[PDB]
């Protein structure tokens, strides 16, 4: 792909790498067809030439031109978009992150136990199949 490149606001974007070490961003100022200023509420602004930083589906409700206070206000209005963000499209990383945190005792018993039950569910599910089948 040459892709989305531009020049507009409201469109959240998600990272294809850099320093930071973060990161999700939305584009505040738009400043030809390569260069753009991306910022976030609790993330640092950067002006990048950013072909290879790709923009996600979920879009946040703001109009064109954002200084800092305005951006904050927009974020407050939205939020919700971050949840979609924790989950899903780009976005994903809070559900994944929930994954990484887990090779650890308390964490390992919570797991055998999800498992143990999962089994009980397989068994109920299987019984159901048998009644349905014939």
């Amino acid at each position: 792909m040459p892709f989305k490149r531009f020049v507009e606001i409201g469109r959240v974007a998600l990272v294809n790498y850099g320093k930071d070490y973060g990161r999700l961003v939305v584009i505040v100022d738009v400043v030809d067809q390569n260069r753009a200023l991306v910022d976030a509420p609790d993330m640092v602004r950067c002006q990048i030439n950013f072909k290879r930083l790709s923009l996600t589906d979920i879009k946040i409700d703001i109009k064109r031109v954002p200084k800092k206070t305005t951006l904050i206000k927009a974020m407050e209005e939205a939020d919700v978009k971050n949840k979609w963000e924790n989950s899903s499209w780009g976005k994903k990383l809070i559900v994944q992150k929930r994954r990484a945190s887990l090779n650890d005792f308390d964490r390992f018993k919570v797991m055998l136990a999800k498992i143990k039950r999962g089994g009980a569910i397989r068994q109920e599910l299987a019984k159901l199949k048998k009644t349905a089948a014939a």
Partner: protein, 104 residues
């Protein structure tokens, strides 16, 4: 682009070989036992099973056997699981090539 999903993959990373056991009379094959210094994360051993360890056979550096043999095995299984791991090598190694730093 690359559509970063990804996974991570990083070269790091050093480790040392503990010692390589070449045994027969005729039932067993060969073992190598490996220690990475700290590295792979409990998650990153676990998610994986499947480390390639590639160690360069580099002059190290008296006059060494500098040959165009870079050897890369695979890590079979933890035995050590939060540290040390078992490994095997498929060509078979250089001389007593125990010791030398292991890398990916």
């Amino acid at each position: 682009m690359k559509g970063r999903q990804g996974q991570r993959v990083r070269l790091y990373v050093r480790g040392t070989i503990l010692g390589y056991k070449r045994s027969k009379s005729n039932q067993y094959e060969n073992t190598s036992l490996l220690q990475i210094e700290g590295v792979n994360t409990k998650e990153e051993v676990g998610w994986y099973a499947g480390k390639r360890i590639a160690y360069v056979y580099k002059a190290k550096t008296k006059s060494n056997d500098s040959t165009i043999r870079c050897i890369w095995g695979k890590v079979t299984r933890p035995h050590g699981n939060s540290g040390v791991v078992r490994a095997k090598f498929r060509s078979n190694l250089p001389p007593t090539s125990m010791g030398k730093k292991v890398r990916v």
